[PDB]
Design a protein around this nucleic acid. Structure first.
Lengths: 143, 128, 109, 118, 131
DNA sequence: TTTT
DNA sequence: TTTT
């Protein structure tokens, strides 16, 4: 018997009961499709396997995909638009990382300091999700 | 299969209420919202609603109350504060493409709600 | 049922069950008498009608009133003293009584 | 009929059931002895009556005597003609930094029986 | 009958039921092994006795060890990597990462570091080790 | 449905 | 099949 705390699309603080733990993600999906979110966006965005990027179920984190005119695939999340960006592989010693897909947006004046991120060569940003390495998990994909 | 909604009452108390099903969730928010109870915070920039929901928006949904003076002055009360209604024309400039809007704000400066674009959603309206 | 969250006089975070909504204020008065508070003081202070000041039930916000026989009215809340319609101190007001329409349930019963 | 939210010695956010309002301070002592705390230390430290400094049950606020340890910090007894405090570390916020940081200050009031060791 | 609030591996705010207080650590290890965390890292990082360092149960705090391809011992916690640092004089072992613009000033230690945990002094507690 |  |  689990409980999960949500923030509705109206910003209301709501708690749902979950009969069995195994149903947790399906419940996040169910309320996430309505724009409901649980928790804050993790430091540097949610981190997922690269192989989950192309068919990721954005409703899992209360987000949705929208394709703009002039052909551009955006992610909307709590009233913010996030853009799909490429991150190059990292190469040095001692850190080697494969390339990544980053969904992110400019930091606005109303963004608190703990959600901001800064890398050299560009201005600060706020990241929603980073798809890098790992191994595909079916639970992240649209059913 | 019950839900719970956490409110801040008119006395600022932190109070939690039970809800039978997600169906009657908006009913409960209307109910306590008519009492001036609120749940959660005002998002930076104000709540964002469709322009077509403005005329008959249910202010109790966010614990607000709309008042209209004999002279037709529209004010909204929310957590003891008065917010005024302003109509904003569309903007087309080098950085902006903003459709027309109605905004409720006060001015410490703060915006409570902005009605702009989007599609009308029936659930936001005063029922009946 | 309902629940109400308090900070006790010792800082403890305690949640009290309430069997029926009609008695919420009574529960607030009960723990309010002990110096327990629920939630935070709104920025600018609480806002109450000016017509409620005289016999406002300070226990509702976990406060108590103090009147000196010398003629001084004070309000104690979370160990701070708010001089006296606005009740404020020097760090900030606790509550302001101005305008509005008088509400019966606020008054000391 | 009552619940209390603790931060355990490991930092876990844990909620405990309590029989009646009268059993509250004891539940606080019980978990306090394990170093669990409930809520925050108020600005300037907690406030207690000077006559309670004698037999004060430190377990009430998750503290222990060795000095007095609370959330892994050591506070020392100081006489002022009894405040407990410690020098401010580099990991302490600008708030609470009074630089020093106080846990408890004993001044005035009437000796409450509930505050002392039973 | 205790309850513990977790932040899951997906960021969800979730509350779990625990039968007896005695079984609490076992519940923390269980979900901690999936990356679930409870509460925040205290400033300066968790404090443990140095005799618990060698076989500390990292799952207790939602963490896991990993030896990277550069052969450096990491602890992964909430997506972040913390490096092991042997310090000598009071000697201690720190698990630290580089500070970021999102890290408040009081969390930083001085290049600026932020520590997950610190093993120093104290007396070895068996509950902290891998069962 | 929506889409900074 | 892992992170700055």
């Amino acid at each position: 018997m689990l409980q999960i705390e949500f923030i509705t699309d109206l910003g209301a603080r709501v708690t749902v009961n979950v009969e069995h733990e195994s149903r947790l993600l399906d419940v996040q999906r169910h309320y996430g499709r309505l724009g409901w979110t649980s928790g804050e966006i993790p430091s540097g965005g949610y981190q997922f396997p690269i192989e989950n990027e192309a068919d990721f179920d954005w409703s899992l984190i209360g987000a949705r995909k929208w394709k703009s005119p002039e052909g551009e695939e955006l992610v909307i999340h709590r009233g913010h638009a996030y853009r799909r960006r490429e991150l190059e592989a990292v190469d040095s010693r001692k850190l080697k990382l494969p390339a990544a897909i980053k969904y992110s947006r400019g930091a606005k004046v109303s963004d608190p300091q703990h959600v901001r991120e800064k890398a050299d060569g560009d201005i600060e940003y706020v990241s929603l999700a980073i798809f890098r390495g790992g191994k595909r998990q079916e639970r992240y994909a649209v059913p």
